Design a protein around this ligand. Structure first.
Ligand SMILES: NC(=O)c1ccc[n+]([C@@H]2O[C@H](COP(=O)([O-])OP(=O)(O)OC[C@H]3O[C@@H](n4cnc5c(N)ncnc54)[C@H](O)[C@@H]3O)[C@@H](O)[C@H]2O)c1
Ligand SMILES: NC(=O)c1ccc[n+]([C@@H]2O[C@H](COP(=O)([O-])OP(=O)(O)OC[C@H]3O[C@@H](n4cnc5c(N)ncnc54)[C@H](O)[C@@H]3O)[C@@H](O)[C@H]2O)c1
Ligand SMILES: NC(=O)c1ccc[n+]([C@@H]2O[C@H](COP(=O)([O-])OP(=O)(O)OC[C@H]3O[C@@H](n4cnc5c(N)ncnc54)[C@H](O)[C@@H]3O)[C@@H](O)[C@H]2O)c1
Ligand SMILES: NC(=O)c1ccc[n+]([C@@H]2O[C@H](COP(=O)([O-])OP(=O)(O)OC[C@H]3O[C@@H](n4cnc5c(N)ncnc54)[C@H](O)[C@@H]3O)[C@@H](O)[C@H]2O)c1
Ligand SMILES: O=c1[nH]cnc2c1ncn2[C@@H]1O[C@H](COP(=O)(O)O)[C@@H](O)[C@H]1O
Ligand SMILES: O=c1[nH]cnc2c1ncn2[C@@H]1O[C@H](COP(=O)(O)O)[C@@H](O)[C@H]1O
Ligand SMILES: O=c1[nH]cnc2c1ncn2[C@@H]1O[C@H](COP(=O)(O)O)[C@@H](O)[C@H]1O
Ligand SMILES: O=c1[nH]cnc2c1ncn2[C@@H]1O[C@H](COP(=O)(O)O)[C@@H](O)[C@H]1O
Lengths: 376, 376, 376, 376
């Protein structure tokens, strides 16, 4: 038995690759399509990967796909749509409080991926501001009975947001909050000590956000979702990644970096459950998609744009492709669960590699005349 | 009281980020849109940030927005316009000396942001050459009574410029000078020891300048405005950043690197207070904008181009947007003043992060079909 | 004889350059067009370079040019075509097993570059899947008498592939297998210990592959073909480089990094020996070229695209240009054989240099109006 | 006198910048438009800079501007044209030997920048091959009396070239040779020990050359012209920089890196003294420009392209702009001669800085609608 008593169970497993901390302490601000994940060993099929992920300290979901509360992406409609497929939705606060109240009543007065509560009503969350008049919003939201709320802000480290956190945690102890936006560990500490139940991480790296180009704030997305998640697991706090998502690759490598759920704003935009309706320009069927920092929210500054993106049909045909993509990525990484993927990442077993710009432009399609890219 | 006697007042504040000197001693020549500023903690509102900044050793301004003396951007017109909103203007020397004399008389013979002197006449500066015949310019400018002058040159380290500095500092002791252009600390020393009252830093990185591509001189702008400002505060000397400004983000992160005022050449071009008048090409209402190093200044070499840029209306609607942008950036950085921003930068409290090209191309708008970008 | 007794034979040979391990342990994921090979000393003509390379442990070839088994590039046709010029071909498994059986019979029932066996029948290989029903494929392939098989898979480190390797190495001892795809040394170990006779290295970096952009797996190609070949020569195992080949430069520097043969998928596509036939779009005579991970192979995910590329005529006029390109590159590197090129690489004598993006965009054609690029 | 006895003459001169060896031993393959030169101190006018540079060990020139021997750029015509303005020209060997003989007779049987010999005939050089039949070329060239010859080759380190060097240095001792192409110090040593009188450095980085993209050889240009010149001054050998020249900036920073003369192939192409004549495409008056490695020189490989570039008129109006550009760059660097520029470079006094891609794209013109770029 001498071949066992040298090391014990584990084979040699040569040291090719870079672990997470030697990748994100080189100082360079890497983003999603700037590194990539090296594979490992698989001993299991694609179908049996369990993507059960946690949203906050008491709310777990069957899929990590959550949506961002903008007025051009989610309502009660894609809320009930993602609640039917395991995710969660948040209702934007860019409306009257009574409209958000009857919106959050419409979803809870309403396929094995459950995401519904103890009394089999659907989990659904919402977004609330941080000004003093927003108390009159979320008290009516509690009468409607919302379960998790998002303290949506450009800067997550205000005196106003931590005062609001102290205002709900004494009044509403069962209710849970989502602090953000944070990008660094200092404001992550300054929210977690206030009693935040989960963070939403990432500012500036949105498909709409130009606040890096306008306010010079923020940081690259992947370094943020690594370092805030690395700090947040010290206290047992999940994080939520926003922005910089264009495909099923970015969300997979995003929650492989320590995130538990990922927040999809543009890639869930222009669906059949999205607000408004379709229109046409140059014969392309597309729906407008607009952030709050654009001046079309209602001496002001603008931190966002107004634009549009082509459609992708219903989510009920779209998010099974997303979970199949997460499912295949967590296959060929080599873990049977997302929890095992983060365990292999923080354990140093799962290894990465930095990627240069030429390997980026060869990572996609190249050296051909024309092509049709259909993902499913 | 044991929780106070371990450290004293200050909390933990984890070490996420890079301070300025570990960012600008890696050797890489970073520019403005190549790094970005990580946020901190705010405990104050947006309106009460005080952007009072110093121009030279006795001239302080209510806003750090100054303009560059080209013949296609400023006259007495945008001089009185920026004097009305706290800034300063300089009159280009590409004219006859009598024309610059009656120009600088028109501005001083002329809304709480003051920028006017002890006898309530407007602060206004001008630009003067460095050849021997320019003595007959600036002595008439002193009879007109200009307060600060800019020794405008491509290379700030001449024997001619320091001889000129010795020529005004014995004749005109109350008059103050602006040396430049410098990009490195050696010529910064060789001007400060001559008695320069403030520097203007940055060559080659202008929107017009091709002298990096033609004379192989200069350096990237952000490293220049960090290192010349880091040397210049040893002697209590402000610096002025030129070039590479396209937006309100670059000027904010520019004066966050140690600059006190920033010099806006192209982003203040094509206004209602700009010289000439508008014209049309392809139905776009645009005004020509041309530097001195172009051959259209009057065996010669050319260090600039002649071109045009689309308009932005009056500055009185435009620079309130700029000060609101500076105001929001200094908010979510976490300082109540620009002086506090530079104190947090040199103290190591304010931290930065390098940014890669993929995080640059995701920092702007991406992953959508079309958009309308309106900043205010 | 004192000039000999200081060192012995070898001259000074200054230390300009970087060897392979100091290039591929900096952590950066370099690819083919991101570094380049510094020249050495030549004492021989171009014609007498011997490009004899090994495919697996008993199969050697006269040229290292092998093709990839897709249904849009190779059949029996380009199999007999590359067997006539020293290479090898593999027949794609995306057909019925009887069709692959009569395909591999058509090639062996069939100009000094030989690549034919002991009984002067042509060497020709094929590709086989990894599912349980594929036993009924490769047993009929053995009745047809195929010599080397490729266990084609997206992830080379499955329990299924090593179980298949154990299933052929006890049944068919003379038959030889090609494991893959691997990119790292760990799965290279986990295939070599099973009894793999040669690897095929590189996933994601194909001209069709978007699985880096979709599944976030893989790594850059040149680092993979360096490190898997550096591990594989410990056990005397050749490797086969796939993907990222656009020209005769990439295959030359690819097999200079430790690869013995290189697998050409797109640059051998759209030939006269390619499947289907030509068609026209915009007046350009081009043939469709499609990978297996596209959904056009037959709730599914897609790891490839369907597209087309312009033609290059017959290979019998094309691969002499490729071997002449390899021949000239191995000339001005300074080795009389590919084996000597790998000996000079692992010995540290042959040296490399990293290349930046500006030197990349000047490495090609630049600073002119228009050009005609004809390679032969 | 205590202020003198601390250091002696020299002031403090702060350590901003990077010297040459800490820039070119970081391992990165920098090229011309990837770094730039920091300014110093000037105490002199633009007109009195002396750009006297050496070609080989006995041939000095009044300007460092030499041309490359291609059949689409130089003849006797631009030979007499550059001999009139201080430079040198070489006649391409892609013709019959009698045609090159009467070409080199036409130039010597023929404005203070002299470049003419002891008996006031014009200095003019030529290019000769390396095959055995080329002896019958250069012996007739010696009867015509050429002064310097270029052993033109893709790879400067052959047994054939050093045998040729031994063949002319015993026969023709007054005649001088130009070895090349070299990019590294090893082949620089292996030519200098043979008796080479000056090198020409740089392969692959030409405007025509695709041999980096085809043969995977070569290196970036600026690192080559630094390191080969750093080795070559150990033996007192000048080097000649080819390729990667688009402007007067690249040649200035090129000979600031240790080169004495620079070889201009494309930027001297399409002149009135260039071969063939003008033609029109899309209404642009342009002349074809083609390298030898293109297949249009006469089973072959191709290392070049055939193309065209727009015209620039006569050189007698063009190279005064080039020497004025060199003259202004050597002004604001801070040296009165090119020899002083190389003395300040190797002495560590002259300092550089690496430049990133964003500072590259801001180094040129940016942030405007349209522009007219006229250099003189
Ligand atoms: N990438 C991102 O995540 C991102 C980045 C920027 C903006 N945004 C979006 O922009 C929206 C608006 O952002 P915002 O926070 O700047 O707008 P806001 O109206 O919520 O706050 C405006 C400013 O007032 C301050 N503030 C907050 N509460 C206050 C109170 N009681 N009294 C006085 N001042 C108070 C804040 O500091 C803020 O700078 C957000 O809903 C967010 O979704 C998102
Ligand atoms: N990005 C920048 O800041 C930048 C860069 C380049 C040029 N420029 C613009 O280009 C304009 C002209 O630049 P310039 O200084 O090269 O033109 P200039 O006419 O002022 O000086 C021309 C040259 O003569 C020399 N000189 C100065 N005084 C002299 C004197 N008495 N006698 C003899 N020579 C003297 C200088 O060294 C200079 O190289 C400047 O006004 C500047 O605004 C700006
Ligand atoms: N750049 C590359 O080299 C590359 C990358 C990706 C895909 N591809 C191509 O895509 C093709 C298909 O790839 P694929 O392997 O994902 O498709 P597949 O049908 O061969 O395997 C599908 C999945 O089932 C699993 N599997 C294998 N054998 C199994 C078995 N008996 N039982 C249950 N599950 C089993 C595998 O893990 C795999 O994830 C391949 O032929 C390959 O050529 C190539
Ligand atoms: N950027 C550059 O500087 C560059 C790079 C590549 C090519 N080129 C141009 O391409 C031209 C041709 O280049 P080339 O040297 O490859 O063509 P060539 O005809 O001079 O040599 C062809 C090959 O034969 C070999 N050779 C030389 N002398 C020989 C001899 N007596 N006997 C047998 N073989 C011999 C050489 O090694 C060479 O690989 C050159 O004139 C050069 O100007 C320039
Ligand atoms: O108006 C805005 N200005 C800046 N960022 C925004 C704005 N609106 C939404 N965002 C961010 O963009 C994210 C959406 O991600 P994306 O659309 O997929 O890039 C949200 O979760 C927010 O963090
Ligand atoms: O003609 C020129 N050649 C080179 N630089 C110039 C010229 N004219 C102005 N500049 C510089 O460009 C700056 C203007 O900044 P910008 O236009 O906003 O890029 C000025 O402050 C000068 O430093
Ligand atoms: O469908 C696919 N999805 C992903 N990779 C593929 C697919 N088909 C072929 N490949 C890979 O692409 C390689 C071909 O190289 P290339 O076409 O020259 O880039 C093959 O050897 C495979 O490794
Ligand atoms: O045909 C060719 N193939 C590769 N390099 C060439 C060829 N012809 C000329 N060159 C190189 O290109 C240089 C000309 O520099 P450029 O045209 O200014 O880029 C010459 O000095 C040669 O070193």
């Amino acid at each position: 038995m001498a071949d066992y008593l040298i090391s014990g169970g584990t084979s040699y497993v040569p040291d090719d690759g870079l672990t997470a901390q030697q990748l994100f302490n080189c100082g360079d601000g890497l983003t999603y399509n700037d590194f990539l994940i090296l594979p490992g060993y698989i001993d299991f099929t694609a179908d049996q990967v369990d993507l059960t992920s946690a949203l906050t300290k008491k709310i777990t979901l069957k899929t990590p796909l959550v949506s961002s509360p903008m007025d051009t992406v989610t309502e009660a409609g894609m809320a009930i749509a993602m609640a039917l497929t395991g995710g969660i939705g948040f209702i934007h606060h860019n409306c009257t409080p009574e409209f958000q109240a009857n919106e959050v009543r419409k979803v809870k007065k309403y396929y094995p991926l459950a995401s519904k509560d103890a009394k089999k009503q659907l989990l659904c969350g919402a977004a609330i501001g941080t000004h003093e008049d927003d108390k009159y919003r979320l008290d009516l939201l509690a009468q409607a009975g919302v379960d998790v709320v998002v303290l949506d802000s450009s800067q997550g480290n205000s005196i106003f947001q931590i005062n609001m956190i102290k205002y709900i945690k004494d009044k509403y102890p069962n209710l849970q909050v989502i602090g953000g936006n944070v990008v660094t560990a200092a404001q992550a500490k300054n929210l977690i000590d206030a009693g935040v139940d989960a963070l939403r991480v990432g500012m500036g790296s949105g498909s709409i956000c130009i606040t890096q180009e306008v306010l010079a704030c923020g940081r690259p997305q992947a370094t943020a979702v690594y370092k805030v998640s690395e700090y947040a697991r010290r206290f047992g706090v999940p994080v939520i990644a926003d922005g910089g998502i264009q495909n099923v690759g970015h969300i997979a490598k995003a929650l492989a970096l320590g995130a538990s759920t990922v927040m999809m704003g543009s890639l869930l935009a222009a669906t059949t459950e999205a607000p408004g309706e379709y229109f046409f320009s140059d014969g392309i069927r597309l729906k407008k998609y607009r952030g709050m920092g654009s001046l079309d929210a209602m001496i002001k500054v603008a931190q966002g744009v107004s634009g549009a993106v082509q459609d992708k049909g219903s989510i009920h045909k779209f998010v099974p492709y997303l979970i199949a993509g997460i499912q295949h990525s967590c296959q060929d990484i080599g873990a049977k669960s997302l929890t095992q993927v983060r365990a292999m990442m923080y354990s140093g077993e799962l290894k990465f590699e930095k990627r240069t710009s030429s390997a980026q432009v060869e990572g996609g399609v190249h050296s051909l005349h024309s092509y049709e890219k259909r993902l499913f």
